[PDB]
Amino acid sequence: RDNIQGITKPAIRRLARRGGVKRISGLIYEETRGVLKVFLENVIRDAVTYTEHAKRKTVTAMDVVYALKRQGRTLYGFGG
Amino acid sequence: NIQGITKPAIRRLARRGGVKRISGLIYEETRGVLKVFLENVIRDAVTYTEHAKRKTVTAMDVVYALKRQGRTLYGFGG
Amino acid sequence: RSRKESYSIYVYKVLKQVHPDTGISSKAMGIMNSFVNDIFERIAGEASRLAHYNKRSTITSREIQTAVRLLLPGELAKHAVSEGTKAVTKYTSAK
Amino acid sequence: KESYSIYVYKVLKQVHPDTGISSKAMGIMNSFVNDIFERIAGEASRLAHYNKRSTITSREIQTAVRLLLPGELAKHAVSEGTKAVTKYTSA
Amino acid sequence: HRYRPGTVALREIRRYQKSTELLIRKLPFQRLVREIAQDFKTDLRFQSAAIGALQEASEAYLVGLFEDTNLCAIHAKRVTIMPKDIQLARRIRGERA
Amino acid sequence: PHRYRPGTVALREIRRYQKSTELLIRKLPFQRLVREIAQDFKTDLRFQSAAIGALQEASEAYLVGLFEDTNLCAIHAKRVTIMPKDIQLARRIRGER
Amino acid sequence: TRSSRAGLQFPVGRVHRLLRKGNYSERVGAGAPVYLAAVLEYLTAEILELAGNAARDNKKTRIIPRHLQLAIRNDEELNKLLGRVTIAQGGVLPNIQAVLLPK
Amino acid sequence: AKTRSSRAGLQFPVGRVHRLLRKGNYSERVGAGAPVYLAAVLEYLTAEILELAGNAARDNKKTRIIPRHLQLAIRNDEELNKLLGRVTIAQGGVLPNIQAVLLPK
DNA sequence: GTTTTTTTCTGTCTCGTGCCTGGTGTCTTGG
DNA sequence: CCAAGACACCAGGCACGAGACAGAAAAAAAC
DNA sequence: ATCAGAATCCCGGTGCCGAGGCCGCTCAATTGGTCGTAGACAGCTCTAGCACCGCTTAAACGCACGTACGCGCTGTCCCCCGCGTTTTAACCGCCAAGG
């Protein structure tokens, strides 16, 4: 519960600065939280489905790798 | 050459897009982006036909090249 | 004369089931054939990845189920899984 | 379960022979290599099934490398591949 | 007499959202495609259905890219398009580096 | 004292965070949010840490790209202040609805 | 035919053949093509059902592809599925930004 | 030369790749020249990108390649960047993109 | 603020071996 | 007309350690 | 508002043409029968995922406060809409020669 509100405004600030964003409006943060949430919804749904067919109650890094390759947002680094 | 693209054609493209008011340099910019688009498409299409060892590009190869750019189009047997 | 393929008669019958008083154009029938092609291809590719991320080479219906609910969005997918599962029961219950 | 580590070491000593590397750099490299191998191989399988050819020779691999990589990389890769074909075919 | 501007354009938007027929007619489009096709290997023959496929894909492509560009300009507190808008939309999609 | 009417703070920290390498969102609250989303489709699931680190990596990359195109939308808006419908336009063009 | 023995409408053995010649695995089970065929069957049922409603809208009897593109672009999950999909003789949504409507 | 790698004068195992093709469900049969050809392409790609890796790591007086080096070397290339457009590196970040509207003038 | 220039203590990496498993030589036959 | 296999022969390939060795920072310390 | 009048919609009409019925084939689904190992399953073992807490500390939160880009407004000036005036793209049968 409420770890969606565990997203801090200075973290959003830091992401804007590495993102290169200079000026920050105030109506941004919860919109950011909602987009991040829907993203992670689709991600973990697919990863857990890959683990559903895996017949193992633990999800691996490889699972999340394969699932994000399925979305085409494909990330290297951890093998897969 | 590339100037076979008429002004009211790109205007009709705005109309089916639903765009109201049109500037000037739009026309030449449009022809350029269309050119690069067709460049990549027909390049890998002729690559397909190169592997086909045949002297006519198939519509199939056009379809598969569109798939290769992730631009899947139905309709013409694909 | 080489014999070519279509799926036209099958989905044609299905259309006649769901709408008896309805015609169709030929090009759209080809479009639906391409539609079946595309969906089948994405499913089969997910099946091959199911194989290689499971290090197995047998294909059963369970893999098809998990492939469909990997590809398709939820509510539609669960209805389709229901249809397929009831069909599995009706077939394999008999011969 | 083999990674490609000393292969990378030998390529590296053939190019910048005074250069170290981290572990996770090697991991990203092998991720890269596997991705490229899978993309080319699947595209070659598409060549087979789109062309009804029951096997795959090197010509399919050449045209697939054309289909994936753009111009300069493609031409230099075709050159290197044919040179390897030549030297392996000679002996 | 004279009509007031903007009206006829939107009326033909309502007209041109109806028929899915091809906007660019055939012969000049064919010449352009042939001319670009000239510089890969000499004088390749063509299937006319493939030409229609190229035409369809090109027109739908450009229409959708116009839609995003138009929405960019609507966001830009303006009504008229700019070439920089096309640059912005393309920079979001990632054609050019 | 040396209060400094602004400009060096933001851009200097941009210079620092682009000299940087590692993450920005710290670990535990992100992990707990992940498990709360995870507690919705199949209960009681266990995880290895590298999966979570990949999730954090790709999450921050996703948001970085959102911020970049949002920044260019703002620059085209002749402003430096961001807006929410900037992000909505960016995700409209990205096809991720 | 197994399709009739499954009480369905798509030919099983053609699909079983295509699974073999697709290099899709090494071996092929018994009822996996039945499940896949039923999936296809419900998918095309839903799609063409909405297409039938689209023809009911225009009061047309023969399906034009414009009906197909419209019914794709109306429903949510279907349009998120076929996002990267276009169709010849497709067209788009009849859509007007009312901020560009006159006053 | 007993080994085909020595018969090719290269650095990758070819019969590895041939077994990968066989244990791939890729084709039914696989010829003799295709695995050699593909492995040579792979070896060229490795050497080519590791060139930009070597220069990008040498930019900072560090003997070891870090992931930030790899992302920099990719984004400073044109063909590799359009290659890796949908691609993200772990521990990557992005380029210095300081807009001209931002510097104190 | 930036950045440079000393130790230091220090994490990884390359050398170093043994075990082993896939890699290799070649005919038949067939597609 | 040479791969598939099928069998017969095999030195490499990698896991584990060691000691060293490139390296991040502590902290003066200029611009 | 409010009328005149362009612009579009919408209703028989007919025509023509392809969708759909239809019908006689033949080749893959079937049917049945025969090896075989892949995997469903039982079970062993040790790792690692989890939970918990104590200590450290740097990181967030609230507020004080100016302040300065965002914005509503303004004037302005200009340059696309559009309607008018030709105009050349492109698909086509005489009429000269002319031999």
PDB file of N, CA and C in Angstrom, chain E residues 49-76:
ATOM      1  N   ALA E  49       0.650  -4.554 -58.858  1.00  0.00           N
ATOM      2  CA  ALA E  49       0.072  -4.710 -57.531  1.00  0.00           C
ATOM      3  C   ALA E  49       1.057  -4.286 -56.457  1.00  0.00           C
ATOM      4  N   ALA E  50       2.345  -4.557 -56.680  1.00  0.00           N
ATOM      5  CA  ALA E  50       3.376  -4.092 -55.764  1.00  0.00           C
ATOM      6  C   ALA E  50       3.450  -2.575 -55.753  1.00  0.00           C
ATOM      7  N   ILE E  51       3.224  -1.960 -56.910  1.00  0.00           N
ATOM      8  CA  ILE E  51       3.208  -0.511 -57.007  1.00  0.00           C
ATOM      9  C   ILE E  51       2.044   0.059 -56.213  1.00  0.00           C
ATOM     10  N   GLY E  52       0.878  -0.583 -56.310  1.00  0.00           N
ATOM     11  CA  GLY E  52      -0.249  -0.172 -55.486  1.00  0.00           C
ATOM     12  C   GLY E  52       0.012  -0.350 -54.002  1.00  0.00           C
ATOM     13  N   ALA E  53       0.769  -1.391 -53.645  1.00  0.00           N
ATOM     14  CA  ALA E  53       1.132  -1.617 -52.248  1.00  0.00           C
ATOM     15  C   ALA E  53       2.012  -0.499 -51.714  1.00  0.00           C
ATOM     16  N   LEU E  54       3.054  -0.151 -52.472  1.00  0.00           N
ATOM     17  CA  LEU E  54       3.909   0.980 -52.150  1.00  0.00           C
ATOM     18  C   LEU E  54       3.114   2.263 -52.002  1.00  0.00           C
ATOM     19  N   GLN E  55       2.150   2.468 -52.896  1.00  0.00           N
ATOM     20  CA  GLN E  55       1.345   3.681 -52.885  1.00  0.00           C
ATOM     21  C   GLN E  55       0.480   3.766 -51.637  1.00  0.00           C
ATOM     22  N   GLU E  56      -0.197   2.664 -51.313  1.00  0.00           N
ATOM     23  CA  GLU E  56      -1.022   2.581 -50.115  1.00  0.00           C
ATOM     24  C   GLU E  56      -0.212   2.846 -48.856  1.00  0.00           C
ATOM     25  N   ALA E  57       0.913   2.135 -48.713  1.00  0.00           N
ATOM     26  CA  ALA E  57       1.713   2.221 -47.498  1.00  0.00           C
ATOM     27  C   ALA E  57       2.290   3.611 -47.329  1.00  0.00           C
ATOM     28  N   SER E  58       2.709   4.214 -48.438  1.00  0.00           N
ATOM     29  CA  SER E  58       3.269   5.549 -48.404  1.00  0.00           C
ATOM     30  C   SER E  58       2.223   6.569 -47.984  1.00  0.00           C
ATOM     31  N   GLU E  59       1.017   6.472 -48.553  1.00  0.00           N
ATOM     32  CA  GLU E  59       0.006   7.477 -48.246  1.00  0.00           C
ATOM     33  C   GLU E  59      -0.488   7.371 -46.812  1.00  0.00           C
ATOM     34  N   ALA E  60      -0.695   6.151 -46.313  1.00  0.00           N
ATOM     35  CA  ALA E  60      -1.140   6.005 -44.928  1.00  0.00           C
ATOM     36  C   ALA E  60      -0.067   6.461 -43.948  1.00  0.00           C
ATOM     37  N   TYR E  61       1.193   6.121 -44.254  1.00  0.00           N
ATOM     38  CA  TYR E  61       2.353   6.561 -43.494  1.00  0.00           C
ATOM     39  C   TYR E  61       2.398   8.068 -43.333  1.00  0.00           C
ATOM     40  N   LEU E  62       2.328   8.771 -44.452  1.00  0.00           N
ATOM     41  CA  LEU E  62       2.371  10.217 -44.417  1.00  0.00           C
ATOM     42  C   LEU E  62       1.157  10.825 -43.737  1.00  0.00           C
ATOM     43  N   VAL E  63      -0.022  10.204 -43.862  1.00  0.00           N
ATOM     44  CA  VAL E  63      -1.210  10.747 -43.205  1.00  0.00           C
ATOM     45  C   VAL E  63      -1.069  10.668 -41.690  1.00  0.00           C
ATOM     46  N   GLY E  64      -0.595   9.528 -41.190  1.00  0.00           N
ATOM     47  CA  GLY E  64      -0.425   9.392 -39.751  1.00  0.00           C
ATOM     48  C   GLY E  64       0.643  10.314 -39.201  1.00  0.00           C
ATOM     49  N   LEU E  65       1.733  10.481 -39.956  1.00  0.00           N
ATOM     50  CA  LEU E  65       2.778  11.389 -39.511  1.00  0.00           C
ATOM     51  C   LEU E  65       2.285  12.828 -39.520  1.00  0.00           C
ATOM     52  N   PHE E  66       1.412  13.160 -40.474  1.00  0.00           N
ATOM     53  CA  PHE E  66       0.731  14.443 -40.429  1.00  0.00           C
ATOM     54  C   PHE E  66      -0.144  14.602 -39.212  1.00  0.00           C
ATOM     55  N   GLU E  67      -0.813  13.534 -38.785  1.00  0.00           N
ATOM     56  CA  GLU E  67      -1.685  13.641 -37.624  1.00  0.00           C
ATOM     57  C   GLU E  67      -0.888  13.992 -36.382  1.00  0.00           C
ATOM     58  N   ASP E  68       0.235  13.297 -36.179  1.00  0.00           N
ATOM     59  CA  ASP E  68       1.082  13.629 -35.037  1.00  0.00           C
ATOM     60  C   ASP E  68       1.670  15.031 -35.153  1.00  0.00           C
ATOM     61  N   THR E  69       2.037  15.450 -36.364  1.00  0.00           N
ATOM     62  CA  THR E  69       2.596  16.786 -36.539  1.00  0.00           C
ATOM     63  C   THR E  69       1.549  17.857 -36.264  1.00  0.00           C
ATOM     64  N   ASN E  70       0.315  17.600 -36.685  1.00  0.00           N
ATOM     65  CA  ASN E  70      -0.786  18.512 -36.445  1.00  0.00           C
ATOM     66  C   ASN E  70      -1.061  18.642 -34.963  1.00  0.00           C
ATOM     67  N   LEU E  71      -1.022  17.528 -34.236  1.00  0.00           N
ATOM     68  CA  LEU E  71      -1.248  17.605 -32.800  1.00  0.00           C
ATOM     69  C   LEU E  71      -0.095  18.306 -32.092  1.00  0.00           C
ATOM     70  N   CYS E  72       1.122  18.185 -32.634  1.00  0.00           N
ATOM     71  CA  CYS E  72       2.247  18.964 -32.121  1.00  0.00           C
ATOM     72  C   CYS E  72       1.985  20.454 -32.245  1.00  0.00           C
ATOM     73  N   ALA E  73       1.502  20.878 -33.411  1.00  0.00           N
ATOM     74  CA  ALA E  73       1.257  22.300 -33.620  1.00  0.00           C
ATOM     75  C   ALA E  73       0.096  22.809 -32.777  1.00  0.00           C
ATOM     76  N   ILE E  74      -0.925  21.975 -32.577  1.00  0.00           N
ATOM     77  CA  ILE E  74      -2.030  22.327 -31.695  1.00  0.00           C
ATOM     78  C   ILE E  74      -1.534  22.513 -30.276  1.00  0.00           C
ATOM     79  N   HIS E  75      -0.597  21.667 -29.858  1.00  0.00           N
ATOM     80  CA  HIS E  75       0.063  21.885 -28.582  1.00  0.00           C
ATOM     81  C   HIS E  75       0.900  23.151 -28.586  1.00  0.00           C
ATOM     82  N   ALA E  76       1.418  23.539 -29.744  1.00  0.00           N
ATOM     83  CA  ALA E  76       2.318  24.675 -29.841  1.00  0.00           C
ATOM     84  C   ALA E  76       1.592  26.012 -29.876  1.00  0.00           C
TER      85      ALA E  76
END
